[PDB]
Design a protein around this ligand. Structure first.
Ligand SMILES: Nc1ncnc2c1ncn2[C@@H]1O[C@H](COP(=O)(O)OP(=O)(O)OP(=O)(O)O)[C@@H](O)[C@H]1O
Length: 110
């Protein structure tokens, strides 16, 4: 016996199933982002680990604290909003780190 429900599934794209998997498995890292004024900006490692655990637990939305506010992170539509707000919402996403050249170096003697 077997099923398509025995594995994970990704959001839509213009790429292929062998591209999305390769972008992830080529490093095995992860990060979360949200749309600010000038583009996508990364969450704190304190915070993004809570978002990363929520889709792994099975919940459809989780909660997080910031500079002075509680934001509800919805995993279904990939957005954030305040607990009292039903309509107005800001975009979030998952992404992967590629690692800089600073990750490669010689022996401790030089
Ligand atoms: N995902 C987030 N992580 C951390 N801080 C956030 C996040 N979303 C909002 N903030 C910050 O919390 C503060 C208030 O956010 P709020 O959503 O009220 O801003 P806003 O006035 O609606 O912004 P804008 O109209 O520019 O989108 C701002 O300093 C904002 O950058």
């Amino acid at each position: 016996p077997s099923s398509g429900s025995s594995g994970f599934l990704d959001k839509p794209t213009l790429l292929s199933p062998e591209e999305l998997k390769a972008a992830s498995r080529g490093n095995g890292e992860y990060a979360w982002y949200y749309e600010g004024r000038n583009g996508w900006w990364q969450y704190d490692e304190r915070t993004s680990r809570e978002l990363e655990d929520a889709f792994s637990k099975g919940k459809k939305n989780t909660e997080m604290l910031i500079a002075g506010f509680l934001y509800v992170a919805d995993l279904e539509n990939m957005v954030q909003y305040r607990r009292n707000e039903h309509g107005r919402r800001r975009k979030i996403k998952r992404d992967i780190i590629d690692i800089p050249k600073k990750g490669v170096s010689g022996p401790s003697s030089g």
